[PDB]
Design an enzyme around this catalytic site. Structure first.
Site, PDB file in Angstrom:
ATOM      1  CB  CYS A  89      -0.962   0.022   1.226  1.00  0.00           C
ATOM      2  SG  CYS A  89      -1.466  -1.578   1.887  1.00  0.00           S
ATOM      3  CG  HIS A 348      -6.298   1.582  -0.821  1.00  0.00           C
ATOM      4  ND1 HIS A 348      -5.274   2.505  -0.882  1.00  0.00           N
ATOM      5  CD2 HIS A 348      -5.809   0.525  -0.148  1.00  0.00           C
ATOM      6  CE1 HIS A 348      -4.215   2.019  -0.262  1.00  0.00           C
ATOM      7  NE2 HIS A 348      -4.505   0.802   0.151  1.00  0.00           N
ATOM      8  CB  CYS A 378      -1.420   1.904   7.397  1.00  0.00           C
ATOM      9  SG  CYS A 378      -2.966   1.456   6.524  1.00  0.00           S
ATOM     10  N   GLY A 380       0.169  -2.963   4.670  1.00  0.00           N
ATOM     11  CA  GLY A 380      -0.016  -4.369   4.947  1.00  0.00           C
ATOM     12  C   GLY A 380       1.340  -5.037   5.190  1.00  0.00           C
TER      13      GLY A 380
END
Lengths: 392, 392, 392, 392
Positions: A89, A348, A378, A380
């Site tokens: 991400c 996203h 953030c 993953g």
């Protein structure tokens, strides 16, 4: 003299809905319009590009090195180079930092960096070489498997969102209010035309007509609290995280053109921003949505900035739960954060999202005359990434 | 200040044969052995690692960010970060340049960099979301589609090899000889134990028995000119490029632990080398094999070195055709090039390859007391990457 | 002894459009509705049925013996038997003939027979046991492969349509005018409730609401000659066969309750007809469309009837090319052929087609007062089938 | 007179082991060899054949109407007709009855009827028209789904075999003892040359060597009781049915040439037998193996025979359990049952099996001089098929 890198121009496609506007559009085709847009916006020719760097999490089936396909489509010369990268991400922002570093070490003059993703076009797969003697076997959704699931515990990212909701004591009502707010803010920005400057229209080539896509299609209009409240917990049966207070599955690309500050001065370019610092930090996978906390903190320390010096922030809204926990810990004024809505609304597109939020930050800093910005996500598997931008 | 980064230590697995020793081993498990090995050989603990950076071309179905998987498996702490990158055949070497830049720009102190690849485990895929209303559809071999095919003109990399054979007027005999010589040199080197230093054994955990792999299994023993001469051209029914004068499909991992030259010294480490320069340049895709030419030149210019200054060279042998054209144009003494054989014999685990030949270069440099080296690879889609290394 | 078999009763589901009303409805489910329907229509109990026979061409992935699955769902007891058969396009009428023979030979008293097809639910398939070491493979559309493709020449059924068209010198304009005439006939019969009698409603069991389908959905309302004359040849490129003048891809089921004439008198049943004769004959696969000519002639000879004695005909409209040819050769009055339109409008659910048209004939023979009727279909792989029915 | 229908000739391929001798042989190729062999052995021209009737359970992907393909490849002319049928495991013996009925009703003079099956060629499949929006799916083994799985309760046939065992109180040692006995009987016979006559050799067309398959390769030589007692149960984890006392997965084809008795005598043909009766019956699906009981009692009532009367039996061994229970209930002398072994040893090519055991019966009846014979089988889903044979 210490290197100073600037962002001369930026652009993004609209963010398409899952199997929506870009349902059968290869990520590189999106990336190629974004490359052509940063170039045209900056007054820089494709000829001058040294490298293209494109964060991308789901390239399976798209052919060798989708980043080079994008550069090549956009008319970047064969003499240039290109590569893809994956910090999940965070990718789209990390690429920008990697771009900056090429210039800082004297290895390049002109870089297009960002990311691109077509979650819609991600294929299903199976390992079939050994061969399946007998019985049924799984065809695996590469988008879930390679983009959305924890590699070390097996579960959806949403389960980390719950871990964060439980830890920070974030009610369902707090999370849904946040969700509704993201939608209403993104709707208002969209209606007022605040996304036009950053969006480059994308021509979806058809058999029975070409379609110009230039509006973010995932944003829900007139989103109600009730619409959120009615949903079922998606991951835990007495959970709190739902499909409505989570971001979706999306398609898009986003990039920036970078150069040295002195180079932009030679060309007469009024840059969108100076890159003052960046950082990436790890956290517990189990609470990966907390990443922005140590990453923003470290980025700020690197710039010599207080949290309170910031005039605008984009903190990516993977889940309402994690966006809430981040805002609480940092303590920055929530009225300066995702002022035109966030990912819950906008979507996203994993590998593009870091560049997408950067684009939003940059064009909002210009429009409101904000001096100091920060974008952060953030990641993953438990990481953060953040970037400080100062206006010239 | 002109940062100076050293390679403190390095390691690689043996290189596995397609569907052979590592047939069902995920790439990140290979990587995790190599991470552990660079650490143990350098006297650096896993807790000290700031970032892991791993080139990988074929991660489909392995789950989210295999680099992170590798790093976590090896006990690299959750507070560090990790990411994958993709510059096709160049990736394993580029990752090392990019780890160097992390340290050069003050963002990290300690980096593990290289690549990993399991071509064996690469799955078959299809885009199936839209559905298939009617008619046949392909399950696509991701290995070929995303690793080995030209994305623009659609053909296998061997075709670009033919293009280079034609352009440089390289006979079948010359290519076959080059091929036989790679085999013979690799076998010699293997029997005499020259791969031993570079190789970290890898335990293939079984059910009915753990097997230790520590020998390069692709290397054919007692390879004859007649076995090469009897093959049919593989891409062009009247061509020159064959399975025997081409590299193979392979599995491996390989890496370097990096840090500043001042840090190695503090630590009392005797490093394998200083990175003096790197370069990446594009070429015409149709003749991608010529990659190493402009990248090696640019790398040497950057270092301030003449071709003649080099004491050792690893130039990746994707195809005998291109390895020959590279050696012709550069004109470096071929007796210093791939002195322990190359990839026609050793294999070509795509994303790991660049770090694999860097491993071979470093340990032979140390062995023979060579001061100046260069590693370079050709890159699919029309690129080259190269790195200059000086002994301390 | 001269046996005498009657069709006590009959019914069909509506004919669904490709990926339409029955897009997710399994064949045997459509089948089970039709089986109970003939039972209820006849006033015979399910527990009286000795055996069920269903024509079915595309049963892959539906599970073991879908004829036994449709019989069991429909509440026919376990003590009975059931089986499926495949004579491709003629299966549905051929099954009717096979049942008559069970009773005639003294092996059964009461038979249900017909055909069922879901062309929507036909999967794609690949032989995957050996395993696939390397390379793409084909995912094979069983609807195309096992249903619409000639096995001996490898081309689509539509190509055999071109052959017959050229043989018979059937113009595009003539083919189209048939096609619009069939659509206009059908649309007229539908509106007028002439399909009501034979159609048994099917309930598509749902999550978000049940749905009753009782209307043939493939019939194009307001079929014009101009809309026809605009289409492009589907198979050949300067050909004459289009999607508009060939039948479609469809789902549905159809059946008939059979018993001895005396049995029906015992039970007060007023049968739809007596089966006087039937016949099957082969022809050249390249001109498979001519099949009904020898078959219909054989059938008429077995019945001891002349062509001019027929009052009603249902001759399946596989392709306007072939339908036009059959009619031209036999010379039966066009005004008594496919009176309520044919397959070009109604669709062609392969395995079911032949009982489908049997239903249409039988009920329209009831309605207008016709005494002699003939049913016939051309068959892929170069066959014909036919049946003669006489009113009681 | 009376319809008296005789088997003029009979022939069968050897039965292949799963993924073995006929691993890549399509069923219709096995079928064509058998049709040609019935013709030769009788002295009947292929052009005299009216229709070909081939049971077949697993035709997915073999293409349009494989019975037609078998017939055409075998040299039966285009004028003849051909079709497939599925009563699952009875398909191959039921087909013989169907053909007999064609001749008894005067619709046909000469029929070739039997069964064919490539369980090795049976593909994997999935329904993908609608598309798979998101998430994993199963590719389904059609062999299992459509061939060995009870469609009603969901389970493998070996669970119903378990149900008959617990119900009939058949120990692990009892079933083991029947299995060894069926292997010895079958091995003994094969060594004696007792399969020679029935078997027509099949030619496996290879690239690096043709191969002549003329031996049943699923038969295991030197079968002991201890290897059988050392097996773990396959279906129930604490059960009693194993791979060893249950039949296998296999390939093969088998058929009989049919004509009236008056006809045989005109052609100077000495028939293998006269078909005197037959029958098919249903039973509880849960205990499907018991099918052969009511079907044989029926068959015998229709022949007007007593069980005693019988001089030879072929009762198909789907499992050791179902078999022992069919042997126990009917109370026929076990010595005359599967005298040259059974399906445990020989194998079980689903849609071919019924035709397989008919061959063994007919040919062993000829050699040993038995006048009255019976063949019978149990059928998945809950049915029995059976046929009484008399030698002339």
């Amino acid at each position: 003299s210490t290197p100073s890198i600037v962002i001369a121009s930026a652009a993004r496609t609209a963010v398409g809905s899952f199997n929506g506007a870009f349902a059968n559009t290869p990520a590189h085709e999106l990336g190629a319009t974004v490359i052509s847009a940063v170039l045209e916006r900056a007054g820089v020719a494709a000829g001058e590009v040294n490298e293209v760097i494109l964060g991308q999490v789901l390239p399976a089936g798209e052919g060798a090195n989708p980043a080079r396909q994008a550069a090549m489509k956009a008319g970047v010369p064969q003499e240039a180079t290109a590569w893809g990268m994956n910090q999940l991400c965070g990718s789209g922002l990390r690429a920008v930092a990697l771009g900056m570093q090429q210039i800082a070490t004297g290895d390049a003059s002109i870089i297009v960096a960002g990311g691109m993703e077509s979650m819609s076009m991600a294929p299903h797969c199976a390992h079939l070489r050994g061969g399946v003697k007998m019985g049924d076997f799984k065809m695996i959704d590469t988008m879930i498997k390679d983009g959305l699931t924890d590699a070390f515990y097996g579960y959806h990212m949403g389960t980390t969102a719950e871990n964060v909701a439980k830890q920070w004591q974030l009610s369902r009502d707090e999370q849904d209010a946040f969700a509704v707010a993201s939608q209403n803010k993104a709707e208002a920005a969209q209606k007022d035309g605040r996304f036009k400057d950053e969006i480059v229209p994308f021509i979806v080539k058809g058999r029975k007509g070409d379609i110009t896509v230039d509006a973010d299609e995932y944003i829900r209009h007139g989103a109600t609290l009730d619409s959120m409240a009615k949903l079922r917990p998606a991951f835990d049966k007495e959970g709190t995280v739902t499909a409505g207070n989570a971001s979706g599955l999306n398609d898009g690309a986003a990039a920036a053109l970078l150069m040295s500050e002195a180079e932009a001065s030679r060309r007469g370019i009024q840059p969108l921003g100076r890159i003052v610092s960046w950082a990436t930090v790890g956290v517990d996978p189990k609470v990966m949505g907390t990443g922005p906390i140590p990453a923003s903190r470290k980025a700020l320390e690197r710039a010599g900035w207080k949290i309170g010096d910031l005039d605008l922030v984009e903190a990516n809204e993977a889940f309402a739960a994690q966006a809430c926990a981040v805002n609480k810990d940092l303590g920055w004024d929530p009225s300066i954060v995702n002022v035109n809505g966030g990912a819950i609304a906008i979507g996203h597109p994993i590998g593009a999202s870091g560049a997408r939020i950067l684009n939003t930050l940059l064009f909002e800093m210009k429009r409101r005359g904000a001096r100091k910005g920060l974008a952060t996500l953030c990641i993953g598997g438990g990481m953060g990434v953040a970037m400080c931008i100062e206006s010239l």
